[PDB]
Amino acid sequence: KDILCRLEHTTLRKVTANTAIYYDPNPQSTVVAEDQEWVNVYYEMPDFDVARISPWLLRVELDRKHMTDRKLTMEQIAEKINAGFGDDLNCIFNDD
Amino acid sequence: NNELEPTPGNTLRQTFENQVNRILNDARDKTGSSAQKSLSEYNNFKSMVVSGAKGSKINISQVIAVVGQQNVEGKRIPFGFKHRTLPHFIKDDYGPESRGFVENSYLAGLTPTEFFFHAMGGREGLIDTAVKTAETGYIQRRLI
Amino acid sequence: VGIRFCQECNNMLYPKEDKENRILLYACRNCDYQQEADNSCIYVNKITHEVDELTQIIADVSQDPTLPRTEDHPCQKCGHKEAVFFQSHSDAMRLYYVCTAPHCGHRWTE
Amino acid sequence: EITPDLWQEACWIVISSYFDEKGLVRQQLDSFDEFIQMSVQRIVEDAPPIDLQPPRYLLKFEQIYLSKPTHWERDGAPSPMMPNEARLRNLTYSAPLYVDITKTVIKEGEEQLQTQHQKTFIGKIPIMLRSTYCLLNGLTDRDLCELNECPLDPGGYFIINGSEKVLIAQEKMATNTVYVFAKKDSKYAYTGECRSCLENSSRPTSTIWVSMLARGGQGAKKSAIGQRIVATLPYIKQEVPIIIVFRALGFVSDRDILEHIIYDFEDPEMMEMVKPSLDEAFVIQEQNVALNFIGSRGAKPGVTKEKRIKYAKEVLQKEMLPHVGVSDFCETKKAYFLGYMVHRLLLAALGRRELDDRDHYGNKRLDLAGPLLAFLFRGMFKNLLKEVRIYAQKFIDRGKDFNLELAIKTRIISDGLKYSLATGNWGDQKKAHQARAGVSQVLNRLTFASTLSHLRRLNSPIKPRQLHNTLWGMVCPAETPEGHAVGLVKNLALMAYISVGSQPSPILEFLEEWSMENLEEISPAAIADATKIFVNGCWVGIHKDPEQLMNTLRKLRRQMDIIVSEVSMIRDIREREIRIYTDAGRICRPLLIVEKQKLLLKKRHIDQLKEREYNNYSWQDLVASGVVEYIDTLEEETVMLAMTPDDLQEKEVAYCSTYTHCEIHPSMILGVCASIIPFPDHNQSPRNTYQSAMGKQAMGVYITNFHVRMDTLAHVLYYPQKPLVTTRSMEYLRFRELPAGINSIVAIASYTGYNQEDSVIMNRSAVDRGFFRSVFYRSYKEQESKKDQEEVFEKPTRETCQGMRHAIYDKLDDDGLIAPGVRVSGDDVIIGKTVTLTKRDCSTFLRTSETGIVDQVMVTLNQEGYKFCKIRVRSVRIPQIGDKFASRHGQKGTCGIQYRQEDMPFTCEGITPDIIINPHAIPSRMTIGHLIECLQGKVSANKGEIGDATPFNDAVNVQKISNLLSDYGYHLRGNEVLYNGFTGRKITSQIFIGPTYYQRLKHMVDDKI
Ligand SMILES: [Zn+2]
Ligand SMILES: [Zn+2]
């Protein structure tokens, strides 16, 4: 199954639950109150909020079947987007 | 009732059809081996099958027992009108007769619905013959 | 999610943030009308479309002669037994229900 | 009151009334009869007056006048013309046409002179034989044979220069609707289409698309905003986007552009979709700018803005959706039905509605001789006007007078309607690789079942080949040609009827007498729950309680008060609409009606049908009393049928209980030549198709006036027999007064071996008694033509005329024609024609060297005044080795060897079968119809009663065919002990004998030697 998953062209459309755009410039007062635990975790000891984060928020949800069907990691999604577009796209992985 | 696990590879739709085309080619053949064996030693169809001079022992298993399934495009009859293959049926008819399968055999005659469905399975194979004379009549006069 | 139309100009209000307030606004172009945005969400882009079909299911499909009427399941609230079911008409072999005996129109799913 | 098990003879009564009244070729006697009734009034009516220019001239026609067909026979004397005279003289069977003309001249000084030309000769229309204008219609049966005509000749073919032509039905796609198809590779995703036109007037089409672009866009042009919608308008070589079009309709604001597109403004799943199309059409607001945007892409792009204000103003009200409105005030109207297409563009782009199949025959309109000649008469009534535009404007310089009776060129109409209806290149003769050829085929005369099923014929315009599900009841599934067109040529069924056409105004003038506020009275927030109401594709009004509007409209077709029987009215439910079709060229069939449990065909009806004489209760009081009902191909999508009223009304385990209709008898779905097959539910369907193409070829007595005719290729049997095993619809196909073959005692045996799997051993001591012995006639055209090298009929002496063979001139008479009763051999001179030069030599030899007898010679004039002659050389043709035979059950065969009564294997009772067919031709060709007809003819020649082989009769199975055979002293499987032919040994096995109806085809062995 490890060999099986290394051949399929898996984009992120296959694992996306849904996608939205908010406008939460303060992370401490986001429209979602549920993520405010772990959004603070990346901002209690924050990294690279140096000059100005753009005040938007692209929130993508992921899946349960299609995310353990291929043993996908929240790091290797976030690391490949960070390697795909540079450090000027502040991508935050969270917990399954 | 959402009580059928989809076999991996296909959806619940394509695994529904493979599940039901399984139960219409076993009864097409459990009515096909018990018909050949039951024919007598003097039976004159058996003299042209055992002797092997005329092959296709499936084409006299439709005389006696069951014509079987019809298909177009490799699928049992698609919904033409609006989810109803003919105006005699209800909607949501995935049943074993409203999509093509034929209980009757040519000796007993055919239901006036099933005469239309065998008119459709005999049209898909009546064209391909008119196509496969402009295909293999062209490979052989080109490969020479 | 839906479109907010422009007041007294009747066009579509683009969303535009206000950096001088750090507060979202809607804005027109052909006039200068704005609006206090109370939504904080531009759009959603649903991939699953796990859609309740029952919004789309019309209670007028109860006087159609070409549907499989049954008496196995009674109504959800009216106690009437003529339940006429059908497909989804759209990955699923789901059957939905519609009660007959009008001024009832209720629908449910098994 | 109700018939339980008397249903079988009941349903064959109500059909007998049907083919009495309508018959088999009324589909060209409704259609062509309606084309000369008003659709040659209407084209003369709507075409605008020539208003040519001080003086001015106005030219306005009036009511038009027909006649009965007439020949102006070259002597300065007129004379009427009858169809058996027009065939023999190569005439064209047509009637003159006469118009009243009003004609005003203006002569400078405020008083004008008007004139009139009463009943001016303008031209001719080829009358279809036997339809209300022919000389035949008006004649009873005995009066019709005092002119050498046939009482069984169906009619529906106009003679053109002597020969017989039939306008085949050229099938097209239905107009005035909204097609949401899908495309595979192109630069779109879910495109729409409409093909608007009104009343079959001028402006033939304007195929406006509305198409959604893909999401495979590059950069931030589309991909960062999403999919957009465009509008491929006609006469614009671009993709003018949507909101620009609505702002050219006099609209401004983006609520009053989305109040014509999306109905509910409270559903975010649709509102997302139109959102990236407002962004592209965003900078234009004023209607002076969008109309500049639209006109800047035209035929020739204008330079000033005042051109591009002028040009696209008539684009968007004259050549874009004409049928919704053609006036200069339909801006508010067009705004909806253009906005309606975008609403059906989104309903398939979202997957919230099924998209339209392309095959489905609810989308198909047929055309018959009526609509096709209307397409050919418009393109030739303008040419009459065009030379009057030319002749008058070349006379404004004089201004002396004006004369129309020298100005109407009558040969415009009387050639193009005769050219394009002769050859088939359907259009004018000046641009030939632009037409739709194959219309107006030439008519068969072989069988009289061919002559029928050559007239009930559709024609696809090129998946059009597989068999679609909407051909239950309309078209025959079995019958189709083989070879280069399988399924592309389809022949009609028996109970199929094609609508003729009607005017839609007395339904719109009924709807407003009940309900239905129009489009001017809708606040379009009150349109999210209404059932939108269509007429002819046009959209007029809405309604709130459609259950009452459904019943009120149904009970006017079932009583024929206001809505005609022709119109069908269709309510879909989930798409929330009502459609009404007053449309010309659909197809529809009659069914019985069910009333909540049971029929409306009650016993008191069919006891009055049974005495059809002296009560005149013949199907025209059974429609009017509301028992039957015409149902088209696309209300069948809304209907519930039962096969049989016996088993499908008795409650069993309640399969379904909401039956609306029932069908008459389910074997009426087979066409003409597929009804002649006994037991066609017992045949493997490659063989019902196979026979339905061999039924055309099998010769027989074709029309009972072949003594008078002068055809080429006239085959006629000596002793045809009506079949012993028959269908109950042979009677209506007229196959007792004109049969097509002889029976034959046939045995299924292997023998000396001359039957190798498609061959047949005959019996020469049965062929001596006239078995299949038939005549083959022949004909010869011979136009004397004086030109100047001219030629005359004469007798050539050998040493005064040039090149000729050793064909001795004994048979020629005093003038150069052979008298009838002179046996001509192979290659001797029959007409001694000489191009005068010493003189050249132009004999016309007997081809094929057949050695027959010259049977009849007629001598007439041509169309012009030149002497003519036709000659009918007849020959018998005894069935030799070679001549090809075939049953009704596929399996065409040859003739191997002809044995003797001496040698053919005799039964216990001195029967020696006429024909032996191979055993091995049964189980792989797979016709078990052939082993039951051969069984049924052995019962029915001892029961003494002509048998029953209707397709789904359910009362004739092979068990009680057997036990009726067993009551005469035979073996009940049909077997019988033959003896040997040569030795007299009893054969170790039995042989299966029985009479079976064989046909002798036209694939003869003496057609090639
Ligand atoms: Zn505005
Ligand atoms: Zn209820």
List beta partners, residue D761.
Answer: D916
Q: What are phi and psi of B31, to 5 degrees?
A: -90, 20
Q: How many helices (H) and strands (E) does chain A have?
A: 3, 2
Q: Provide the sign of the torsion angle of the four alpha carbons D984, D988, D990, D996, taken in this order.
A: negative
Pairing between strand C34-36 and C41-46? Answer: unpaired
Do D415 and D668 touch, CB atoms closer than 8 A?
Answer: no
DSSP string computed for C97-110? EEE-SSS---EEE-
CA-wise closest residue to D776 among D720, D714, D717: D714
Does the CB of B5 have a partner CB in chain C at under 8 Å?
no
Q: Provide the residue type at A8 as one letter.
A: E
CA-wise closest residue to D633 among D474, D494, D477, D497: D474
Using the structure block, give the residue that is written with the tokens 């009066």: D143
Helical axes D331-349 vs D305-318, angle rounded to 10°: 70
What contacts B94, CB < 8 A, 6 or more positions away? B16, B20
| D242/D257 Cα distance (integer angstroms) | 10
Using the structure block, give the residue that is written with the tokens 């082993």: D931
- Residue contact D268–C5, C-beta within 8 A: no
Query: Coil, strand, or helix at residue D306?
Result: helix
| D900/D766 Cα distance (integer angstroms) | 8
Q: What element of type H or E holds D715?
A: strand D715-717
Query: Coil, strand, or helix at residue B37?
Result: helix
Enumerate residues with CB within 5 Å of ligand 1 (an ion): C 6, 9, 11, 28, 30-31
Q: Provide the residue type at D123 as one letter.
A: G
List beta partners, residue D854.
Answer: D822, D873
List beta partners, residue D589.
Answer: D631
Do D443 and D154 touch, CB atoms closer than 8 A?
Answer: no
- Measure B1 CA to ligand 2 centroid, in angstroms: 21
Using the structure block, give the residue that is written with the tokens 């019943």: D551
> In the C/D pair of chains, how many CB contacts fall below 8 A?
56
User: The tokens of D536 are what?
Assistant: 């002819």
SS3 content of chain D, % helix, strand, coil (to 5): 20, 20, 60
Angle, alpha carbons B2-B4-B6 (nearest 5°): 110
Q: How many CA atoms lie within 13 A of A5 on its CB side?
A: 10
Cα dihedral value A25, A27, A31, A35, nearest 10: 150
Do D392 and D57 touch, CB atoms closer than 8 A?
Answer: yes
CA-wise closest residue to D2 among D645, D671, D714, D475: D645
Query: Coil, strand, or helix at residue C84?
Result: strand
C-alpha R_g of chain A: 15
Do D566 and D557 touch, CB atoms closer than 8 A?
Answer: no
Q: Which residues of B touch D643 (CB under 8 A)?
A: 88, 112-113
Q: Which residues of B touch C85 (CB under 8 A)?
A: 92
Produce one character per residue of D810-821: b if its CB has 16 or more CB atoms within 10 Å, e if not. ebbeeebbbeee
What contacts D140, CB < 8 A, 6 or more positions away? none
Pairing between strand D915-917 and D742-748? Answer: parallel
| D432/D114 Cα distance (integer angstroms) | 42
Do D581 and D633 touch, CB atoms closer than 8 A?
Answer: no
- Measure D254 CA to ligand 1 centroid, in angstroms: 9
Closest-lying ligand to the alpha carbon of C76? 2
A61-64 long-range contacts (CB < 8 A, ≥24 apart) are: A61/A16, A61/A17, A61/A18, A61/A19, A62/A15, A62/A16, A62/A17, A63/A15, A63/A16, A63/A17
| D627/D605 Cα distance (integer angstroms) | 9
User: The tokens of D702 are what?
Assistant: 């074709």
User: Scanning every residue of chain D, which has its alpha carbon at the shortest distance from the alpha carbon of B56?
Assistant: D924
Do D825 and D811 touch, CB atoms closer than 8 A?
Answer: no
Which residue in the set D547, D574, D657 is minimally distant from C89, CB to CB? D574
Which residue in the set B1, B16, B91 is minimally distant from C87, CB to CB? B91
What contacts D224, CB < 8 A, 6 or more positions away? none
Query: Coil, strand, or helix at residue D630?
Result: strand
| D606/D616 Cα distance (integer angstroms) | 13
| D868/D706 Cα distance (integer angstroms) | 20
User: The tokens of D580 are what?
Assistant: 């009404």
Compute CA D752 distance to the chain's CA centroid, rounded to the nearest angstrom.
Answer: 49
CA-wise closest residue to D812 among D845, D852, D789: D845
User: The tokens of D633 are what?
Assistant: 């191909």
Question: Chains D, A in contact: 3+ Cβ pairs under 8 A?
Answer: no
D188-194 long-range contacts (CB < 8 A, ≥24 apart) are: D188/D212, D188/D213, D188/D214, D189/D213, D189/D214, D189/D215, D189/D227, D189/D349, D190/D345, D190/D348, D190/D349, D190/D355, D191/D345, D192/D341, D192/D342, D192/D344, D192/D345, D194/D321, D194/D341
C-alpha R_g of chain C: 22
Task: Please check if C75 is assigned to a binding site.
Answer: yes
Q: Which residues of D touch B123 (CB under 8 A)?
A: 465-467, 477, 486-487
Using the structure block, give the residue that is written with the tokens 């619905």: B113
Q: How was this structure determined?
A: cryo-EM
CB atoms within 10 A of CB D83: 25
Please give the CATH number for the structural domain made up of A2-96.
Answer: 3.30.1360.140
Which residue in the set D467, D483, D655 is minimally distant from B130, CB to CB? D483
- Measure C18 CA to ligand 1 centroid, in angstroms: 18
| D647/C14 Cα distance (integer angstroms) | 66
| D989/D975 Cα distance (integer angstroms) | 10
Exposed / middle / buried, residue D453 (Cβ in 10 Å: 0-12, 13-18, 19+): buried
Q: Provide the residue type at D478 as one letter.
A: A
Query: Coil, strand, or helix at residue D389?
Result: helix
| D253/D260 Cα distance (integer angstroms) | 12
- Residue contact C2–D271, C-beta within 8 A: yes
Do D615 and D662 touch, CB atoms closer than 8 A?
Answer: no
What contacts B54, CB < 8 A, 6 or more positions away? B48, D920, D923, D924
- Measure D531 CA to ligand 1 centroid, in angstroms: 33
CA-wise closest residue to B106 among D915, D672, D686: D686
Which residue in the set B48, B111, B121 is minimally distant from D923, CB to CB? B48
| D911/D939 Cα distance (integer angstroms) | 16
Do D321 and D194 touch, CB atoms closer than 8 A?
Answer: yes
Q: Which residues of B touch D636 (CB under 8 A)?
A: 81, 87
| D645/D660 Cα distance (integer angstroms) | 12
Q: What element of type H or E holds D59?
A: strand D56-65
Q: Over D823-862, what HEC string results?
A: ECCCCCEEEEEEECCCECCEEEECHHHCCCEEEEEEEEEC
Q: Provide the residue type at D996 as one letter.
A: T
| D79/C102 Cα distance (integer angstroms) | 72
Chain A touching partners, 3 or more CB pairs below 8 A: C
Residues 6 through 35 of chain C touching chain A, CB cutoff 8 Å: 17, 22, 24
| C81/A46 Cα distance (integer angstroms) | 63
Eight-state DSSP code of residue D915: E
List beta partners, residue C34.
Answer: C27
DSSP string computed for D776-832? E------B-------EEE----TTTB----S--TTS--SSSBPPSSEE--SS-EEEE
CA-wise closest residue to D660 among C69, C64, B80, C98: C64
Eight-state DSSP code of residue C54: G
- Measure D252 CA to ligand 1 centroid, in angstroms: 11
Please report, in angstroms and rounded to a whole number, the separation of the first and last CA atoms in chain A: 21
Q: What CA–CA distances, in Å, run from D793 to D484, D782, D786, D814? A: 44, 10, 11, 10
Using the structure block, give the residue that is written with the tokens 């209806």: D421
| D215/D213 Cα distance (integer angstroms) | 7
> In the A/C pair of chains, how many CB contacts fall below 8 A?
36
| D915/D762 Cα distance (integer angstroms) | 5
Closest-lying ligand to the alpha carbon of C59? 2
User: The tokens of B84 are what?
Assistant: 């109803």
| A23/A25 Cα distance (integer angstroms) | 6
What contacts D123, CB < 8 A, 6 or more positions away? D96, D97, D384, D410, D411, D412, D413, D414, D417
Q: Which residues of B touch C95 (CB under 8 A)?
A: 92
Q: Which residues of D are catalytic?
A: 758
Q: Provide the sign of the torsion angle of the four alpha carbons D106, D107, D112, D116, taken in this order.
A: negative
User: The tokens of B126 are what?
Assistant: 């009546």
Query: Coil, strand, or helix at residue D43?
Result: helix
User: The tokens of A53 are what?
Assistant: 């984060």
Residues of each annotated binding site of D for RNA: 697, 805, 840, 892
Compute CA C32 distance to the chain's CA centroid, rounded to the nearest angstrom.
Answer: 32
- Residue contact D639–C66, C-beta within 8 A: yes
Produce one character per residue of B62-75: b if its CB has 16 or more CB atoms within 10 Å, e if not. bbbbbbbbbbbeee
Closest Cα in chain C, distance from residue A20 (Å): 4
User: The tokens of D888 are what?
Assistant: 């009704």
For chain A, domain boundaries: 2-96
Q: Does domain C46-110 have CATH number 2.20.25.10?
A: yes
Does the CB of B91 have a partner CB in chain C at under 8 Å?
yes
Q: Where do you find CATH 2.20.25.10 in chain C?
A: 46-110
CA-wise closest residue to D848 among D869, D868, D867, D830: D830
What contacts B137, CB < 8 A, 6 or more positions away? none
User: Scanning every residue of chain D, which has its alpha carbon at the shortest distance from the alpha carbon of C5?
Assistant: D255
Please report, in angstroms and rounded to a whole number, the separation of the first and last CA atoms in chain B: 60
| A90/B50 Cα distance (integer angstroms) | 78
Angle, alpha carbons C88-C91-C93 (nearest 5°): 45
List beta partners, residue D459.
Answer: D170
Cα dihedral value D583, D584, D585, D591, nearest 10: 60
Q: What are phi and psi of D963, to 5 degrees?
A: -80, -10
User: The tokens of A10 are what?
Assistant: 């898996």
Which residue in the set D684, D923, D957 is minimally distant from B109, CB to CB? D957
Q: Provide the residue type at D659 as one letter.
A: Y
Q: Provide the residue type at D966 as one letter.
A: S
CA-wise closest residue to D94 among D426, D422, D448: D422
Query: Coil, strand, or helix at residue D619?
Result: coil
Q: What are phi and psi of B107, to 5 degrees?
A: -65, -40
| D69/D80 Cα distance (integer angstroms) | 6
Cα dihedral value D278, D283, D285, D287, nearest 10: -100
Q: What are phi and psi of D662, to 5 degrees?
A: -145, 160
Please give the CATH number for the structural domain made up of D177-364.
Answer: 3.90.1110.10
Q: How many CA atoms lie within 13 A of D182 on its CB side?
A: 12
Q: Provide the sign of the torsion angle of the four alpha carbons D288, D294, D298, D300, taken in this order.
A: positive
Question: In which region does residue D567 sit, left (phi positive, over 0), alpha (psi from -120 to 50) or beta (all else)?
Answer: beta
| D702/D717 Cα distance (integer angstroms) | 9
> Gaps after which residues in chain B, C–N over 2.5 Å?
none
DSSP string computed for B62-76? HHHT--B---BTTBS
CA-wise closest residue to D576 among D512, D634, D533, D540: D533
List beta partners, residue C45.
Answer: A19
Q: What CA–CA distances, in Å, run from D201 to A42, C88, D193? A: 74, 43, 21
| D294/D615 Cα distance (integer angstroms) | 67
User: Scanning every residue of chain C, which has its alpha carbon at the shortest distance from the alpha carbon of D283?
Assistant: C30
CB atoms within 10 A of CB D369: 29
